[PDB]
Design a protein around this ligand. Structure first.
Ligand SMILES: Cc1cc2nc3c(=O)[nH]c(=O)nc-3n(C[C@H](O)[C@H](O)[C@H](O)COP(=O)(O)OP(=O)(O)OC[C@H]3O[C@@H](n4cnc5c(N)ncnc54)[C@H](O)[C@@H]3O)c2cc1C
Ligand SMILES: Cc1cc2nc3c(=O)[nH]c(=O)nc-3n(C[C@H](O)[C@H](O)[C@H](O)COP(=O)(O)OP(=O)(O)OC[C@H]3O[C@@H](n4cnc5c(N)ncnc54)[C@H](O)[C@@H]3O)c2cc1C
Lengths: 473, 477, 473, 477
């Protein structure tokens, strides 16, 4: 008989969903959460994990702040007497965002209390396959459990380059930055780097995106380059095939960044107010002392079976930390919940990780579900792939003459037979709202015939999917 | 033997789609289109029908103008130094919407000329089942065809009351109104009346909605009343169970409307700048002289079979004018295209009028696809229906502290067996964008299990459809 | 035997052309020019008349300054690393414009000297049909001539309203304004008012256009309203059906303008830095003392025959001052020259005033030649008029997504028979450059058949005239 | 009896215009288009032919990028606080031009699908005078037609010299070049070479123009040398009477070009980053197997009569591929349209290839219509020609103190009688905009008297055409 039925390590999207569901199902549970402050700035936050504190939530709010500035300009074109010469108060915007997050933290902490989840604000590390050491600000504990669920997530990476830690920041620091970003170098062209560059430009700052190799690795590369081009159209410089060499602080207070072209070797430099590293996120395996429990890792990640079990029978892992699965909030939440149901609610339902939709909240948004064109072609052969595509115009864009250059969508499908849809891709306004329903359609076996014969809702941009007609072949 | 293989009467959503597709399939075709100017005001417009000129398009653009006003107010809460105290220039707005429409009109003229559709700008009426009289300003023509497709659509109705035509206006006039609407009575609580009231309020004018009986007849009534309540929250008054009796013009130029409560019998009155009749649309059967062709009508509409045939074998009808089918643009377009394909392309594919999605572009939008809750209960019995529902909060509403009182969605499904979804209903931002993909999912056989196990995109409002865990009957379990 | 063969009264476009041509043809000539300083500011300028000093020339230069600011923004869209956050130095721009004009003045004054035109810097008024009083700064003269040519032009009008002279300015003052215009009320929607509002917006000022009745009276009203709408699209407020009531100076230094809606009677007010009156130009008949010579006038103008003769045999008039003819520089110049040739070169050629092309140099320019649509319909009947029209897209506009809303052109023609072109109208870039050649085509009897069968030059916007196809009927 | 009434071979300016017009006139038509990738680089592109993908359009957009750089410099002189020290992002520019092109490509696909033109993406060759072999990636088809229209256009030529294909590029590659052109040798002084050299210099690169014999062969040689001189003024060196001998790649990646002076025989060399061959375009007759259809050729071109007929009665040719007519897009478009009208529309109207206007989009543009001065002298005799000419100053050049040295225009006319204008020539800003309307005037019979008495629009540069008072022979009188 142990202290707990279940100890969950990590109090984020997966950990909290799993812990709450387990208690609902009669388990006695503890959930550990600790937030190691950022190096240099010492930025820290409350319970609830990455998304609510330093992820999806603040990112979406800043994106909305940027979109609202665009909307003020558009209002004038529609006849509103608004003065569109406008500027945001960064400190006011941050205050509003943080006041939301802190309030949610408080609600979450009280909610955990209500549901009988014992929340332990300490860093957990394995002693034994059944024993955990918790390091709280006050002291240590030592606690035991029949089963463990590891839900530790990751943290932003820093490049191994001089000045990177002292002078640079990450997304962890950005969303509560004490001073204005100003001229900022955004190193990394994944969704985090692009989203941040996007909203910083919209708030009247001057971001540059530095790209080591490709834009949005892991996404359809035609679409990735339409996104990049749409950002360049908005006046965001891209430094292509370029890697940072060093950061140093001038007597100015400005940050001198030296950088290098990876193809030519040409070296250059520029001065910035802020340097944001968005080069990836590293799984927090180290602090766990996984060897003490006999748990196998695979570089910064934990490999698990179709039931989220590690190589140790009573140890599970879920969320970002698991090897090879989409690193998204709703994935973590549903996986955490279903795990708790198999453990304590007698369920057999396994998480379905296939065809998970996503949205990149760039200035012109990009959402997709299913296969990229290149992946579909690699898998099934070009001769059995058909791609329907189009450039379209949102009704609202004509009056203000808002750019339609990169309003593009496509459907990637089986060429013959049932013409099963493999992938859907859309760049434009409210992309996540557009794609969501189509992701449920794909799970329901959506074919080209059903798609094209679904009556459109007019006037929308989503209806563009139902009247595709031009094939690349 | 005849002048044309096909004459299409009406050059709107259905007629143009039919005519263009017919020529693509080898038919020699003429398409007649003529716009009768509004009575009083004399408002008129170009080619392409109701949606482009006086319907979906100008309505959507006025709705967008209203939403942009809200956006300015919201920008301030997010820290922008914007001066929040704003007013629209009605003339500038009207002329911008007109430029949008006229540009489309021109593209449509090009498309017709380029595609071998002979455009006749004249009023058509039957001489016999193979012969049409076409009245053009330049002089009449009498033309013959093997087959006719009737695609005449409808026009706004006026109440049979003193002052209605002299002093009132309809949606045909509103979108290009010469001067500001001001204090406006909107008579009618269908989607057209509610949408107009919504954008008028948003542009700083003062609408009242007069409701004869129910709000959004033909829509889920729980959702209809949530929409009405959301508009009241926005300062739009409703006069329930009320009908107009007359309109007269006062010495000060204002319009005195007398009206009656239908339940109490009590009569009252108020003064308005503008009186908008949004009480329904009447099919344009009269001008056609259908008895000359032997075509059966059913009050202002034309009944047709699953192939859009009238009782007369070479005469078809499509779009709003047909009896008892959804009066929407994409329905008209697809139905006209498919009809041409059956006529000239060797196709057997019939139009699918089931589970057609729609959106009401009220200030807080409402979109739905499939059955209303009451229609599902009627068809299958309450004991065979399950309803999953909830309230939600758009991430964008938090900082401006925008009302989430009416942010509500539900799925109406089969209770047992495979739990097929029957209907989906959503009130909130960008409702048509949310519902579209789910309409395709319904066509693909969407079940509750498939829906709830579809992973959400976070943070969005559409993701709320994938996490509907609470039932009306049983809640969580 | 008089002092001179010819005295020309006025040293502008017409007067100088006539005087130079007359001397070329062996006449002994004097040319009087005087510039009455503006009331209030006392703005004054050199010889050469309205166009070079306070008209076409400074207007075109300021329009170009505005277009160049747009071009900097467009350059960034094409990939230039230019910082497009830019502002003009008004004082520097004015200096550059005035340095050009003053230099041209000096060249003109020396040129007149070279050609043996006796330039007399004095205000001329009739004593007799053969005698003129010249009032020079030093003293008076009294001079005689066998023939007179009156070429006095006009001056900006002021509304008969309190504060108009003390606080308002005209185009005469604008082109050398000592301080920045700032927020300006432009009263008048003819070409002068619209052009000035246009370039002021482009230079980062805040103009409003107040319109008594209609925009661009005397121009095709469809086109006039496309021009107005394109200006409103650029963020220039229009106050329609509105007339000014008064101007007063606040303790602020700002100018309070009260104004009234002519249809409703609604009265309102706003504050401006500058109030520009652009309400028309009045012929300078008064100072001439025309009754002393027996010359008939017709309110501020002088009626003449097809040979530019007044009712007095040896007295002629030419340029803006004549009744009922286009008030343009090249019209004045050619009329002045041909007059001198009939008088002294034995010619019989009369000025041709028909189908004179014009350009309104608004932000999106409008040029036309021949009949407006409404005039053609009134004259020939709707049933014998055909109008070919189109919305078009300049190749260059797509990348920067420059507005194509008001890129529109039309041809107004005879419906049947020869299908003679009656009028051509174009709104878009370089409108004057586009229309000029077509104006020569119209003089050569241009028909629709010839127009449509002329091979286009690709890619241009002028080629749009050769591929019109859509008729309004 | 045949599969099609018409097969059009080639889907560029002429072929698409012909195919679309043929369907409008009742023909059943197929249009083949296939783009062979460039040798080395393997550059390829979508539908619509040379102008859209690798011709007028991308050339005009690069020219505009160059003119916008000049505009930034000029803005500073007019008092703008702009930082004048600027450089283009070549990748951003190339990808913007590509987005422009791909958008057009898509519109073209829509237009074809919508208009009943069956688009076959395959390489066509003759089997016999009624039968075509079509090679598609998906497998070949053998197709028959009553009539064929050959509209295959041409491709850039390479010099027959070592290294030409391995190391050199052509205009087909330039517009989408993966990396900056840098120091560039432009071999060829026709409009294509001169235009490319102009925009390369304007974008901060370093072109040299190598000229075998003359500059702008086929254009007025006074104007041609003024254009060359204007480019030298802009820092573009010319290597006159010079031909390339070889290209090789150095260890440092640079390209060593050896070359020869054709007059002296002296050989020299220089190193470049890019070597652009702009030495002419060869007609695509080879792949057609014309001898299978019995069609006569004349070196890389197809001779046709005034109705565009080859020696084979059911086979026509149109666009660049025909012998001895102007190689321009609007010529191809109108000629293809008129051909379809003669074939299927009952028309007798033949294409008018006389007095076709053209513009060379060099840094200072040159446009002309009608005869060169030398061609007019040859045809009528010097004693029957009058030339009116002058220099002028654009109002916009004064403040920036931009060179007016090469702002020159002339009218070449009949000396006596009615003084018919024979040719008009202009070097200056927006030259194509200036010349267009005058080209229509020439078609309408423009005389000197009509020209000089047309009132100018002031201030413009086009007004200079209306005030040409000085002759080469007699000046003012
Ligand atoms: C205010 C309003 C808002 C709307 N909003 C939406 C929306 O957001 N989404 C949506 O899907 N739908 C919307 N609609 C409905 C949509 O506009 C109609 O469903 C659609 O236009 C019907 O197309 P149709 O071809 O049947 O008729 P129409 O588009 O009405 O075309 C009929 C044409 O025929 C002409 N005609 C009639 N009789 C003759 C004759 N005898 N001879 C020659 N010509 C004739 C008419 O003048 C008209 O031009 C809206 C409608 C209104 C009025
Ligand atoms: C760099 C450059 C700049 C230019 N600038 C201008 C300008 O500014 N203004 C202007 O008017 N003109 C310009 N032109 C010329 C203009 O592009 C041509 O005149 C025009 O494209 C010719 O049209 P076409 O239909 O004859 O040939 P193309 O447009 O070349 O079309 C022929 C098509 O047929 C395809 N094809 C060939 N053989 C076969 C086969 N056997 N089977 C299937 N398909 C085949 C080709 O790949 C091509 O797609 C320019 C050209 C170049 C190269």
């Amino acid at each position: 008989s142990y202290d707990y039925d279940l100890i969950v390590i990590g109090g984020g999207s997966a950990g909290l969903a799993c812990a709450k569901e387990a208690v609902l199902n009669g388990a006695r549970v503890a959930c550990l959460d600790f937030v190691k402050p950022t190096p240099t700035l010492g930025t820290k936050w409350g319970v609830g994990g990455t998304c609510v504190n330093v992820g999806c939530i603040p990112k979406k709010l800043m994106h909305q702040a940027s979109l609202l500035g665009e909307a003020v300009h558009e209002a004038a074109a529609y006849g509103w007497n608004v003065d569109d010469k406008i500027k945001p108060d960064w400190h006011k915007l941050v205050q509003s965002v943080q006041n939301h997050i802190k309030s949610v933290n408080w609600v979450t902490r009280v909610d955990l209390r209500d549901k009988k989840v014992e929340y332990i604000n300490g860093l957990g590390s394995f002693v034994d396959s059944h024993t955990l050491l918790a390091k709280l600000k006050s002291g240590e504990r030592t606690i035991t459990a029949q089963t463990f669920v590891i839900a530790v997530g990751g943290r932003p990476r820093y490049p191994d380059i001089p000045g990177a830690v002292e002078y640079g920041i990450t997304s962890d620091d950005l969303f509560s930055l004490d001073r204005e970003p100003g001229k900022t170098l955004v190193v990394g062209a994944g969704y985090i780097g692009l989203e941040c560059a996007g909203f910083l430009k919209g708030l009247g700052y001057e971001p540059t995106v530095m790209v080591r190799s490709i834009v949005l690795r892991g996404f359809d590369q035609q679409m990735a380059e339409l996104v990049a081009a749409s950002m360049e159209e908005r006046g965001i410089p891209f430094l292509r095939k370029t890697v940072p060499l060093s950061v140093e602080k001038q007597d100015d207070g400005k940050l001198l960044v030296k950088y290098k072209n990876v193809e030519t070797g040409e070296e250059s430099e520029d001065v910035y107010d802020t340097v944001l590293w968005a080069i990836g996120r590293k799984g927090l395996v180290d602090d766990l002392n996984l060897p003490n429990a006999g748990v196998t890792v695979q570089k910064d990640k934990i490999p698990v079976d179709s039931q989220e079990a590690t190589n140790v029978a009573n140890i599970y892992a879920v969320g970002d930390i698991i090897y090879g699965k989409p690193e998204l909030t709703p994935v973590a939440v549903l996986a955490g919940r279903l795990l708790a149901r198999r453990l304590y609610g007698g369920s057999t339902q396994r998480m379905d990780y296939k065809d998970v939709a996503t949205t990149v909240f760039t200035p012109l948004e990009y959402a997709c579900v299913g296969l990229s064109e290149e992946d579909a072609v690699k898998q099934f052969g070009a001769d059995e792939i058909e791609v329907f595509h189009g450039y379209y115009k949102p009704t609202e864009f004509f009056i203000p003459q808002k750019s339609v250059r990169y309003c593009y969508l496509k459907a990637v499908a089986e060429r013959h037979g049932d013409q099963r849809v493999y992938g859907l891709h859309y760049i434009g306004p409210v992309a996540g709202e557009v794609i969501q329903g189509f992701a449920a359609a794909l799970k329901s076996g959506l074919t080209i015939n059903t798609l094209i014969n679904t009556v459109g809702i007019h006037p929308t941009t989503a209806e563009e999917f139902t009247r595709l007609a031009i094939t690349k072949r």
